[PDB]
Design a protein around this ligand. Structure first.
Ligand SMILES: OC[C@H]1O[C@@H]2O[C@H]3[C@H](O)[C@@H](O)[C@@H](O[C@H]4[C@H](O)[C@@H](O)[C@@H](O[C@H]5[C@H](O)[C@@H](O)[C@@H](O[C@H]6[C@H](O)[C@@H](O)[C@@H](O[C@H]7[C@H](O)[C@@H](O)[C@@H](O[C@H]8[C@H](O)[C@@H](O)[C@@H](O[C@H]1[C@H](O)[C@H]2O)O[C@@H]8CO)O[C@@H]7CO)O[C@@H]6CO)O[C@@H]5CO)O[C@@H]4CO)O[C@@H]3CO
Length: 80
């Protein structure tokens, strides 16, 4: 059982993490270096997420994405 590192390297000033794991609320990320990071204990399974970056909903382009039932694009983590 192992925590998941969320690391936004896309730049910006104020970044929050949102996802199924927090009912799409906003977790403010702490800036380390030029990046923004959180560590979450996510259980086994699938978890959709997105970033809110300087007032804009945004996904990480390097990471897996899926289209939601809302027609919106989320990143996705799968924990074994
Ligand atoms: O809030 C939870 C939600 O968070 C994240 O979503 C954000 C998203 O990432 C941002 O991009 C932005 O969304 C904007 C979007 O980009 C714009 O295109 C626009 O959206 C309009 C739609 O394009 C338009 O089609 C219409 O939408 C209607 C749907 O088509 C219709 O199906 C229905 O939608 C309902 C869903 O079918 C149902 O499943 C349920 O939706 C839930 C999602 O399935 C679930 O994943 C989660 O959603 C996340 C999302 O995945 C994240 O990316 O919870 C959802 C809510 O419970 O309920 C839907 C109805 O609530 O009805 C809609 C509305 O008629 O209109 C929309 C509005 O114009 O506008 C967006 C800006 O608001 O922001 C969202 C956060 O709001």
């Amino acid at each position: 059982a192992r925590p998941t590192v969320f690391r936004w390297t896309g730049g910006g000033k104020e970044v929050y993490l949102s996802g199924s794991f927090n009912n799409w609320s906003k977790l403010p990320l702490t800036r380390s270096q030029n990046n923004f990071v959180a560590i979450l204990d996510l259980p086994e399974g699938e978890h959709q997420y997105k970033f809110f970056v300087d007032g804009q909903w945004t996904h990480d382009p390097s990471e897996p994405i899926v289209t939601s039932q809302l027609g919106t694009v989320n990143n996705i983590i799968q924990v074994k």
